Amino acid sequence: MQVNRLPFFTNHFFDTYLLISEDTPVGSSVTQLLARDMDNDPLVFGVSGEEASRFFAVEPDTGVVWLRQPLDRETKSEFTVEFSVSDHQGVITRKVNIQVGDVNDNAPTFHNQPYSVRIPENTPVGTPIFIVNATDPDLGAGGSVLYSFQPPSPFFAIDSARGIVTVIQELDYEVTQAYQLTVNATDQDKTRPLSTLANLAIIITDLE
Ligand SMILES: [Ca+2]
Ligand SMILES: [Ca+2]
Ligand SMILES: [Ca+2]
Ligand SMILES: [Ca+2]
Ligand SMILES: [Cl-]
Ligand SMILES: [K+]
Ligand SMILES: [K+]
Ligand SMILES: [K+]
Ligand SMILES: [K+]
């Protein structure tokens, strides 16, 4: 006698992974489930799991997988999602790794503010006095930060890659007792670069 033949998935992505860009708009098709049933039985498709079912939805008859909630690679960069296909006699399931693709959607962040440092007026030229860091969680160029002063300073320099602030001209407590500088931290995305400003207070102390 014949036993029912269960359906099986035919998507090539099950053996590797699915890529979905984090800026994919809700409602978008992210893929279409494909399956075969050698009895030519009508098939129904789904997704299961609390988390998977929250972010993704499946058209039961077409197997089109939709995006149901916005993604954010910086919050969750991948999913293991279980999809199902059924001929109404049995349910077959397979898991797929879904990678969330990066876009540059974060500006750098400065931590441990406010930034202030006290130095003596005889601190010599070339003396490193402060190290700035801004974090950027994006990937590649979009996560690589460069530093500068805006506007520039004739008394202080900041190393662009390293954020090391140095004295570049002799100081003088009587001429200037304090400097308020502005640090620009910008990522290096080619098309959409993002940047952030932080205040740096430099206080000059008197020897006498
Ligand atoms: Ca069947
Ligand atoms: Ca994001
Ligand atoms: Ca990102
Ligand atoms: Ca960035
Ligand atoms: Cl299968
Ligand atoms: K479901
Ligand atoms: K750094
Ligand atoms: K980074
Ligand atoms: K003095």
UniProtKB/Swiss-Prot annotation:
Residues carrying covalently attached carbohydrate according to the record: N133, N184
Subcellular location: Cell membrane
UniProt protein name: Cadherin-23
The protein's assembly and partners: Interacts with USH1C and USH1G. antiparallel heterodimer with PCDH15. Isoform C1: Interacts with CAMSAP3; leading to inhibit CAMSAP3 ability to induce microtubule bundle formation.
Pathology linked to this chain's protein: Defects in Cdh23 are the cause of waltzer (v) phenotype. Waltzer mice are characterized by deafness and vestibular dysfunction due to degeneration of the neuroepithelium within the inner ear.
Every Cadherin domain range: 12-110, 111-206
Domain notes: Three calcium ions are usually bound at the interface of each cadherin domain and rigidify the connections, imparting a strong curvature to the full-length ectodomain. Cadherin repeats 1 and 2 mediate calcium-dependent heterophilic interaction with PCDH15.
Organism: Mus musculus (Mouse)
Tissues where the protein occurs: In adult animals relatively high levels of expression are found in testis, skeletal muscle, heart, eye and thymus, and lower expression in kidney, lung and brain. Found in the sensory hair cells of the inner ear.
UniProt feature coiled coil, ranges: none
Protein task: Cadherins are calcium-dependent cell adhesion proteins. They preferentially interact with themselves in a homophilic manner in connecting cells. CDH23 is required for establishing and/or maintaining the proper organization of the stereocilia bundle of hair cells in the cochlea and the vestibule during late embryonic/early postnatal development. It is part of the functional network formed by USH1C, USH1G, CDH23 and MYO7A that mediates mechanotransduction in cochlear hair cells. Required for normal hearing.
